[PDB]
């Protein structure tokens, strides 16, 4: 219950504490998809949650 | 040498004051490429300068 909704693509070192780390690949599971699109999540390989810029994520086939 | 360098592909949203917003097709002049992967740059449509991911904007090769 609850599972992978986006996949990292490309690389995202963050600068601002809020942001989440992403290594290409990334399995992401999105709570938000803001509207200044940013989007809200948590990386299901590290285990953190926080931000990242919409296109830097694909959407998973449910 | 304020020639263009690049131009934003995607749309880019500020949600951190060191950043420069971004409309696609924005002509650009990066000044530095830093080593974690965000641009520093002028926005020569709006004159307003900040960062934003690098993935969001191609290189011209003009």
Do not use: C
Not at 2 to 13: D, P
Not at 34 to 39: G, P
């Amino acid at each position: 219950g609850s599972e992978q909704t986006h996949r990292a693509i490309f690389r995202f070192v963050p600068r601002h504490e809020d942001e989440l780390e992403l290594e290409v690949d990334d399995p992401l599971l999105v709570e938000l998809q803001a509207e200044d699109y940013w989007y809200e999540a948590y990386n299901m390989r590290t285990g953190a949650r926080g931000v990242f810029p919409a296109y830097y994520a694909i959407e998973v086939t449910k």
